[PDB]
Design a protein around this motif. Structure first.
Motif, PDB file in Angstrom:
ATOM      1  N   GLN A  54       0.866  -1.179  -0.076  1.00  0.00           N
ATOM      2  CA  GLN A  54       0.048  -0.025  -0.009  1.00  0.00           C
ATOM      3  C   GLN A  54       0.811   1.187   0.090  1.00  0.00           C
ATOM      4  OE1 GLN A  54      -2.818   2.616  -0.391  1.00  0.00           O
ATOM      5  NE2 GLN A  54      -2.277   2.670   1.805  1.00  0.00           N
ATOM      6  N   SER A  55       2.116   1.048   0.435  1.00  0.00           N
ATOM      7  CA  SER A  55       3.159   2.190   0.639  1.00  0.00           C
ATOM      8  C   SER A  55       4.560   1.596   0.249  1.00  0.00           C
ATOM      9  CB  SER A  55       2.782   3.100   1.772  1.00  0.00           C
ATOM     10  OG  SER A  55       1.438   2.895   2.160  1.00  0.00           O
ATOM     11  N   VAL A  56       5.415   2.527  -0.231  1.00  0.00           N
ATOM     12  CA  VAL A  56       6.860   2.197  -0.350  1.00  0.00           C
ATOM     13  C   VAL A  56       7.551   3.307   0.556  1.00  0.00           C
ATOM     14  CG1 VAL A  56       8.463   1.887  -2.112  1.00  0.00           C
ATOM     15  CG2 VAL A  56       6.283   0.469  -2.158  1.00  0.00           C
ATOM     16  N   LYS A  98      12.375  -2.254  -8.791  1.00  0.00           N
ATOM     17  CA  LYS A  98      12.240  -0.939  -9.550  1.00  0.00           C
ATOM     18  C   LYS A  98      10.929  -1.012 -10.503  1.00  0.00           C
ATOM     19  CE  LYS A  98      16.652  -2.154  -8.276  1.00  0.00           C
ATOM     20  NZ  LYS A  98      17.339  -2.705  -9.511  1.00  0.00           N
ATOM     21  N   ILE A 151       7.962  -0.298  -7.434  1.00  0.00           N
ATOM     22  CA  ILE A 151       7.656   0.998  -6.804  1.00  0.00           C
ATOM     23  C   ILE A 151       7.233   1.949  -7.802  1.00  0.00           C
ATOM     24  CG2 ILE A 151       9.496   2.930  -6.527  1.00  0.00           C
ATOM     25  CD1 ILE A 151      11.061   0.789  -4.865  1.00  0.00           C
ATOM     26  N   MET A 154       3.828   1.471  -7.938  1.00  0.00           N
ATOM     27  CA  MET A 154       3.153   2.109  -6.813  1.00  0.00           C
ATOM     28  C   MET A 154       2.576   3.589  -7.033  1.00  0.00           C
ATOM     29  SD  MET A 154       2.103   1.680  -3.886  1.00  0.00           S
ATOM     30  CE  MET A 154       2.515   3.100  -3.251  1.00  0.00           C
ATOM     31  N   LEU A 155       3.724   4.300  -7.605  1.00  0.00           N
ATOM     32  CA  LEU A 155       3.642   5.511  -7.743  1.00  0.00           C
ATOM     33  C   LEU A 155       2.424   5.794  -8.655  1.00  0.00           C
ATOM     34  CD1 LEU A 155       6.107   5.480  -6.072  1.00  0.00           C
ATOM     35  CD2 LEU A 155       7.228   7.660  -7.538  1.00  0.00           C
ATOM     36  N   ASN A 174       0.084   3.396  -9.190  1.00  0.00           N
ATOM     37  CA  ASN A 174      -1.164   2.704  -8.460  1.00  0.00           C
ATOM     38  C   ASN A 174      -1.725   1.798  -9.766  1.00  0.00           C
ATOM     39  OD1 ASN A 174      -3.959   2.246  -8.337  1.00  0.00           O
ATOM     40  ND2 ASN A 174      -3.628   3.246  -5.985  1.00  0.00           N
ATOM     41  N   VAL A 201      13.289   8.341   1.516  1.00  0.00           N
ATOM     42  CA  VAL A 201      12.158   8.634   0.697  1.00  0.00           C
ATOM     43  C   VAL A 201      10.820   7.874   0.972  1.00  0.00           C
ATOM     44  CG1 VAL A 201      11.220   8.348  -1.943  1.00  0.00           C
ATOM     45  CG2 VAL A 201      13.511   9.832  -1.426  1.00  0.00           C
ATOM     46  N   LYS A 202       9.711   8.314   1.289  1.00  0.00           N
ATOM     47  CA  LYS A 202       8.640   7.623   1.482  1.00  0.00           C
ATOM     48  C   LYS A 202       7.451   7.937   0.485  1.00  0.00           C
ATOM     49  CE  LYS A 202       4.875   6.878   3.742  1.00  0.00           C
ATOM     50  NZ  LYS A 202       4.216   5.630   4.165  1.00  0.00           N
ATOM     51  N   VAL A 203       7.053   6.878  -0.090  1.00  0.00           N
ATOM     52  CA  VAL A 203       5.837   6.902  -1.037  1.00  0.00           C
ATOM     53  C   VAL A 203       4.756   6.260  -0.548  1.00  0.00           C
ATOM     54  CG1 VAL A 203       5.230   5.965  -3.361  1.00  0.00           C
ATOM     55  CG2 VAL A 203       7.303   7.270  -2.978  1.00  0.00           C
ATOM     56  N   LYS A 204       3.455   7.059  -0.446  1.00  0.00           N
ATOM     57  CA  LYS A 204       2.361   6.530   0.206  1.00  0.00           C
ATOM     58  C   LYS A 204       1.281   6.848  -0.842  1.00  0.00           C
ATOM     59  CE  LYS A 204      -1.248   6.346   3.299  1.00  0.00           C
ATOM     60  NZ  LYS A 204      -2.146   7.717   3.367  1.00  0.00           N
ATOM     61  N   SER A 205       0.920   5.880  -1.731  1.00  0.00           N
ATOM     62  CA  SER A 205       0.059   5.906  -2.835  1.00  0.00           C
ATOM     63  C   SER A 205      -1.298   6.514  -2.207  1.00  0.00           C
ATOM     64  CB  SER A 205      -0.169   4.909  -3.551  1.00  0.00           C
ATOM     65  OG  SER A 205       0.234   4.871  -4.948  1.00  0.00           O
ATOM     66  N   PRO A 206      -2.347   6.845  -2.778  1.00  0.00           N
ATOM     67  CA  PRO A 206      -3.922   7.124  -2.461  1.00  0.00           C
ATOM     68  C   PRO A 206      -4.358   6.132  -1.830  1.00  0.00           C
ATOM     69  CG  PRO A 206      -3.365   7.681  -4.953  1.00  0.00           C
ATOM     70  CD  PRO A 206      -2.348   6.652  -4.389  1.00  0.00           C
ATOM     71  N   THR A 226      -1.547  11.127  -4.406  1.00  0.00           N
ATOM     72  CA  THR A 226      -0.101  10.516  -3.874  1.00  0.00           C
ATOM     73  C   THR A 226       0.273  11.498  -2.970  1.00  0.00           C
ATOM     74  OG1 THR A 226      -0.154   9.448  -5.928  1.00  0.00           O
ATOM     75  CG2 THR A 226       2.036   9.116  -4.474  1.00  0.00           C
ATOM     76  N   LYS A 228      10.612  12.509  -9.966  1.00  0.00           N
ATOM     77  CA  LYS A 228      10.994  11.103 -10.350  1.00  0.00           C
ATOM     78  C   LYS A 228      12.414  10.998 -10.535  1.00  0.00           C
ATOM     79  CE  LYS A 228       7.560   9.257 -10.749  1.00  0.00           C
ATOM     80  NZ  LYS A 228       8.581   7.946 -10.738  1.00  0.00           N
ATOM     81  N   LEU A 236      17.353   5.903  -4.206  1.00  0.00           N
ATOM     82  CA  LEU A 236      17.549   4.678  -4.227  1.00  0.00           C
ATOM     83  C   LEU A 236      18.981   4.149  -4.519  1.00  0.00           C
ATOM     84  CD1 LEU A 236      14.585   5.217  -4.117  1.00  0.00           C
ATOM     85  CD2 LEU A 236      13.989   3.037  -5.354  1.00  0.00           C
ATOM     86  N   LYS A 237      19.655   5.233  -5.155  1.00  0.00           N
ATOM     87  CA  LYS A 237      21.006   4.930  -5.690  1.00  0.00           C
ATOM     88  C   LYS A 237      21.930   5.583  -4.513  1.00  0.00           C
ATOM     89  CE  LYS A 237      18.886   2.857  -8.778  1.00  0.00           C
ATOM     90  NZ  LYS A 237      17.466   2.727  -9.148  1.00  0.00           N
TER      91      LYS A 237
END
Lengths: 69, 69
Positions: free
Chosen positions: A20-22, A56, A59, A62-63, A65, B22-27, B34, B56, B63-64
């Motif tokens: 649900q999240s990364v 890769k 993620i 995920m962005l 969805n 970095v934190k990605v929390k989709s909707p 997002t 992006k 991540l690198k």
């Protein structure tokens, strides 16, 4: 002073239907390794492998969805 | 029941020297948008814009990591 990684293990690529999240926490002066932590839609968490070509895709997706099947 | 986004603000291009995570929390069923949340190397956080060509490039790079002052 003596810190390590936030994840001792990682996944090779689990279904993004649960994720649900990364969360990506690059290395530092303690952990010279990456540690991707994704949040499960069930409330759990599944660490991913930053050394996997599937990480890769779990993620970037995920962005996104969902776009169209 | 009535939730929203976890990002009240966002940045359209930030230095990857400050970003430490970095934190990605989709909707979700609350927010149809997002909410990229990146952690600062100072302990702060900088929300990113999940609709920028640079957002992006600041994440994928994270991540690198690369260097490490």
């Amino acid at each position: 002073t003596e810190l390590r990684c936030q994840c001792l293990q990682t996944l090779q690529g689990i279904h993004l239907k649960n994720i649900q999240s990364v969360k990506v926490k690059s290395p530092g002066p303690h952990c010279a390794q990456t540690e991707v932590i994704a949040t499960l839609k069930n409330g759990q968490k599944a660490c991913l492998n930053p050394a996997s070509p599937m990480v890769k895709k779990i993620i970037e997706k995920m962005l996104k969805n969902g776009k169209s099947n």
